Design a protein around this motif. Structure first.
Motif, mmCIF file in Angstrom:
data_model
loop_
_atom_site.group_PDB
_atom_site.id
_atom_site.type_symbol
_atom_site.label_atom_id
_atom_site.label_comp_id
_atom_site.label_asym_id
_atom_site.label_seq_id
_atom_site.Cartn_x
_atom_site.Cartn_y
_atom_site.Cartn_z
ATOM 1 N N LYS A 210 1.058 -1.135 0.119
ATOM 2 C CA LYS A 210 -0.007 -0.214 0.005
ATOM 3 C C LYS A 210 0.852 1.492 0.088
ATOM 4 N N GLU A 211 1.947 1.295 0.622
ATOM 5 C CA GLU A 211 2.966 2.342 0.787
ATOM 6 C C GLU A 211 4.247 2.030 0.941
ATOM 7 N N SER A 212 5.259 2.812 0.438
ATOM 8 C CA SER A 212 6.612 2.776 0.612
ATOM 9 C C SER A 212 7.191 4.248 0.690
ATOM 10 N N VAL A 213 8.379 4.329 0.733
ATOM 11 C CA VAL A 213 9.200 5.716 0.565
ATOM 12 C C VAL A 213 10.359 5.780 0.117
ATOM 13 N N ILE A 214 10.319 6.741 -0.699
ATOM 14 C CA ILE A 214 11.836 6.966 -1.364
ATOM 15 C C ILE A 214 12.352 8.152 -0.903
ATOM 16 N N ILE A 215 13.590 8.246 -0.683
ATOM 17 C CA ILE A 215 14.261 9.304 -0.227
ATOM 18 C C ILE A 215 15.216 9.787 -1.016
ATOM 19 N N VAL A 216 15.327 10.943 -1.544
ATOM 20 C CA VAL A 216 16.376 11.717 -2.486
ATOM 21 C C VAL A 216 17.345 12.361 -1.589
ATOM 22 N N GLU A 217 18.688 12.190 -1.696
ATOM 23 C CA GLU A 217 19.581 12.935 -1.015
ATOM 24 C C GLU A 217 20.585 13.166 -1.848
ATOM 25 N N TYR A 218 20.642 14.710 -1.804
ATOM 26 C CA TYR A 218 21.760 15.547 -2.596
ATOM 27 C C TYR A 218 22.953 15.914 -1.786
ATOM 28 N N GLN A 219 24.267 15.994 -2.176
ATOM 29 C CA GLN A 219 25.181 16.010 -1.529
ATOM 30 C C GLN A 219 26.457 16.882 -2.409
ATOM 31 N N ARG A 220 26.848 17.847 -2.169
ATOM 32 C CA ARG A 220 27.753 18.470 -3.017
ATOM 33 C C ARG A 220 29.053 18.869 -2.357
ATOM 34 N N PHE A 221 30.093 18.185 -2.726
ATOM 35 C CA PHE A 221 31.511 18.281 -2.337
ATOM 36 C C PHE A 221 32.117 19.126 -2.694
ATOM 37 N N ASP A 222 32.530 20.432 -1.978
ATOM 38 C CA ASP A 222 33.224 21.553 -2.491
ATOM 39 C C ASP A 222 34.655 21.358 -2.286
ATOM 40 N N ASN A 223 35.442 21.953 -3.363
ATOM 41 C CA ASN A 223 36.713 22.126 -3.118
ATOM 42 C C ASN A 223 37.358 23.558 -2.943
ATOM 43 N N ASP A 224 38.347 23.959 -2.509
ATOM 44 C CA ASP A 224 38.900 25.294 -2.422
ATOM 45 C C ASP A 224 40.047 25.428 -3.552
ATOM 46 N N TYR A 225 40.001 26.290 -4.584
ATOM 47 C CA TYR A 225 41.178 26.585 -5.286
ATOM 48 C C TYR A 225 41.687 27.877 -4.860
ATOM 49 N N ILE A 226 42.690 27.829 -4.551
ATOM 50 C CA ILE A 226 43.494 28.941 -3.864
ATOM 51 C C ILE A 226 44.948 29.522 -4.840
ATOM 52 N N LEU A 227 44.713 30.795 -4.909
ATOM 53 C CA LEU A 227 45.886 31.442 -5.687
ATOM 54 C C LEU A 227 46.687 32.361 -4.695
ATOM 55 N N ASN A 228 48.023 32.260 -4.690
ATOM 56 C CA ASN A 228 48.920 33.123 -3.828
ATOM 57 C C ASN A 228 49.922 33.703 -4.849
ATOM 58 N N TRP A 229 50.186 35.149 -4.667
ATOM 59 C CA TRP A 229 51.117 35.620 -5.492
ATOM 60 C C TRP A 229 52.678 35.450 -4.742
ATOM 61 N N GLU A 230 53.253 35.040 -5.839
ATOM 62 C CA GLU A 230 54.768 34.603 -5.170
ATOM 63 C C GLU A 230 55.849 35.272 -6.016
ATOM 64 N N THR A 231 55.908 36.737 -5.692
ATOM 65 C CA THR A 231 56.826 37.744 -6.154
ATOM 66 C C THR A 231 56.797 38.071 -7.778
#
Ligand SMILES: [Mg+2]
Ligand SMILES: [Mg+2]
Ligand SMILES: [Mg+2]
Ligand SMILES: [Mg+2]
Ligand SMILES: [Mg+2]
Length: 264
Positions: A210-231
């Motif tokens: 008569k019934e069941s459940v669906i669970i939709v899980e969304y996950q977003r894995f972020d990265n940090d792209y970093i710039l440093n000035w080196e002279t």
């Protein structure tokens, strides 16, 4: 309210339903085709998930420093649950690993109960990413849509002795930090905008369900792209962000009434 479907001189009745939910720009639409088939000893629903996960790409910085937060992996989990643990994901698409920009496949139902990979067709684009189906069992289908490389061939492991990782570095020599990342129009739309997942599955249930459940899980894995000035030049480093984002949406599969109903 049902519609007759026909195949090889045999007939069944199909019913359709859909519901949609969203939160903070993350969207899940779950659509269903329920089949009541006199020629099968179980019940089946073909489900289609369509949605959206924003990239949340962000840039910060100053004269000598820049940080670009960007989505390295989108993960989509679709879980089936029911109290008597009787209902199963029979199959799901897309399968295995797909490196092509345009993902397209179909899951079909044949009168008698056969499921092949009535049909649900999926379609999405993933420029610069690939899709890996990481789980495919009776109660979980899961996919990672994971970054591969830019058009220039830079990836999260790229390393130059002087410039470091040049992943999203606009210029080796010029620009302030917050102005030295790849322009949006030169990035994959999965980075500049977000991902529009489209996956599908077939659920099988005992006739009396008569019934069941669906669970939709969304996950977003972020990265940090970093710039440093080196002279004399910019140096880039990519790392895992300390944060990720997660949102989930639960839908009741109302087998009795042939309805899909979002749980508030
Ligand atoms: Mg609604
Ligand atoms: Mg399990
Ligand atoms: Mg290369
Ligand atoms: Mg933007
Ligand atoms: Mg949970």
């Amino acid at each position: 309210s049902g519609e007759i479907i026909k195949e090889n001189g045999k007939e069944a009745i199909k019913y359709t339903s859909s519901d949609t939910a969203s939160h903070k720009g993350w969207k899940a639409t779950l659509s269903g085709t329920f089949i009541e088939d006199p020629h099968s000893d179980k019940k089946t629903a073909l489900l289609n998930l369509e949605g959206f996960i924003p990239s949340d790409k962000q840039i910060f910085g100053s004269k000598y420093y820049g940080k670009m937060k960007w989505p390295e992996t989108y993960r989509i989990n679709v879980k089936s649950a029911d109290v008597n643990n009787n209902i199963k994901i029979a199959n799901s698409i897309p399968k295995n690993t797909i490196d092509k920009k345009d993902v397209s496949n179909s899951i079909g139902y044949s009168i008698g109960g056969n499921i092949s990979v009535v049909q649900n067709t999926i379609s999405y684009e993933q420029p610069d990413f690939r899709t890996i189906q990481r789980k495919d069992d009776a109660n979980l289908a899961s996919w990672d849509i994971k970054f591969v490389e830019t058009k220039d061939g830079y990836n999260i492991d790229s390393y130059h002795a002087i410039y470091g990782n040049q992943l999203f570095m606009k210029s080796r020599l010029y620009n302030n930090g917050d102005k030295n990342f790849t322009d949006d129009r030169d990035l994959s739309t999965l980075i500049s905008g977000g991902f529009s997942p489209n996956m599908a599955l077939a659920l099988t249930a005992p006739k009396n369900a008569k019934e069941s459940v669906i669970i939709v899980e969304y996950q977003r894995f972020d990265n940090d792209y970093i710039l440093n000035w080196e002279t004399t030049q910019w140096r880039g480093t990519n790392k895992l962000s300390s944060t990720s984002e997660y949102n989930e949406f639960m839908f009741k599969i109302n087998w009795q009434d042939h309805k899909i109903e979002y749980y508030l």
